């Protein structure tokens, strides 16, 4: 069995929104078994400020910048959504 | 109704049946992509593509277990 090939096939907690669009990743990275994985290019993400992430909870608070993952960076596309953690 | 995790990297290669404990289907159109999540006996979750034959067969096997 190839553990290395499957190292990043684990699920990840996403952020919801009150906007009726898909769930999106916070940023473009996630851990699997404590190891770093990168979301695929084009994956939907939220780019939050350092101030915003301190108060990111399971309820919305302020507007969140939507983006897409590009080589591990969540690049903003101009759209704003009211995002929050799924439970 | 809203999935608490979503899959964005799907395991292409077969997971041995002896390692599998259970599965759940992520079918919500609210995740960016649909997936099957297998839970292993070590309690790890592994994302897989519901369109692979081995995924469908592993689901049938676990249904019989």
Residue numbers in the entry:
A (entry chain A): 15 to 101
B (entry chain B): 4 to 68
Quote the study on this structure.
Evasins are chemokine-binding proteins from tick saliva, whose application as anti-inflammatory therapeutics will require manipulation of their chemokine target selectivity.
To understand how class A3 evasins achieve chemokine binding and inhibition, we purified and crystallised complexes of EVA-A bound to human CCL7, CCL11, CCL16 and CCL17, and solved their structures at resolutions of 1.51–2.01 Å. All four structures display the same fold and 1:1 stoichiometry. The chemokines assume the expected compact globular tertiary structure composed of a three-stranded antiparallel β-sheet packed against an α-helix. In the EVA-A:chemokine structures, the side chain of the chemokine CC + 1 residue (Tyr in CCL7; Phe in CCL11, Leu in CCL16 and CCL17) sits in a deep hydrophobic pocket within the evasin structure, possibly enabling the ~35° rotation of the chemokine relative to its position in class A1 evasin complexes. Moreover, CCL7(Y13A) and CCL11(F11A) exhibited substantially increased affinity (~10,000 and ~200 fold, respectively), suggesting that the interactions of the aromatic CC + 1 residues in these chemokines had imposed an energetic penalty that was relieved by mutation to Ala. Thus, we conclude that the preference of EVA-A for CCL16 over CCL7 and CCL11 is because the aromatic residues in the latter two chemokines are energetically disfavoured, a phenomenon known as negative selection.
